Design a protein around this ligand. Sequence first.
Ligand SMILES: O=C(O)CCc1nc2c(=O)[nH]c(=O)[nH]c2n(C[C@H](O)[C@H](O)[C@H](O)CO)c1=O
Ligand SMILES: O=C(O)CCc1nc2c(=O)[nH]c(=O)[nH]c2n(C[C@H](O)[C@H](O)[C@H](O)CO)c1=O
Ligand SMILES: [Hg+2]
Length: 202
Amino acid sequence: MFTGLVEAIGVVKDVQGTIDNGFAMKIEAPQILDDCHTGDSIAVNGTCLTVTDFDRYHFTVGIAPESLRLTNLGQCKAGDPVNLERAVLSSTRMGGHFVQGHVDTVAEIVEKKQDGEAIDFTFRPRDPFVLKYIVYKGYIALDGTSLTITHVDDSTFSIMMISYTQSKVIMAKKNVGDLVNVEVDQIGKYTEKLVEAHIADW
Ligand SMILES: O=C(O)CCc1nc2c(=O)[nH]c(=O)[nH]c2n(C[C@H](O)[C@H](O)[C@H](O)CO)c1=O
Ligand SMILES: O=C(O)CCc1nc2c(=O)[nH]c(=O)[nH]c2n(C[C@H](O)[C@H](O)[C@H](O)CO)c1=O
Ligand SMILES: [Hg+2]
């Protein structure tokens, strides 16, 4: 479980494996390894992954084919920066929201323009149906970043990235064409089943 408040930006140091069988990945991130333990859950670009080994400077993870299929981790190369956030089990969320780290799909950046001190991003999800769980002013996690929806229609959604965030996440420097991990606010899927189980009586 996470908050979507990215703690640091690590750097991929080694990637081995294949798209069909899985990746073994090594990440440099001393900033968040002071309290590491094998088995811990760490979100890499919003993808919850299990620590398989670590030291004061690096930690490794095993990435399953399905994780690589639904996220941008399949494109990872040594040298790439990634958003990182350590797990936390808390029933409270005063900052960010309830991010599970279970990515729904990827979205392509289709527009990026400056609006004052903020950056206006527009994304096109590979799986349009996730848009049914996205609403104006609602939450969403992009590459593990908790953000506020500023616009949404039948094929895209947008967010505004403020100055404070631009220096904390990899999104700031991504461009049109790049992919980001999308995790819609889980509550939406919950209310969907609620109405379904509801009219399941009507
Ligand atoms: O909660 C736990 O105890 C398990 C942690 C965990 N680990 C991995 C992993 O190590 N490798 C993985 O490849 N996946 C893990 N996952 C699932 C992963 O996040 C998911 O496939 C993507 O987000 C796309 O939806 C995990 O949930
Ligand atoms: O809790 C709320 O109602 C606000 C949600 C929220 N929105 C944004 C945003 O829209 N743009 C943003 O640029 N940031 C938002 N943030 C903060 C952002 O996640 C954080 O700076 C990074 O992850 C690094 O820790 C938000 O928390
Ligand atoms: Hg998880």
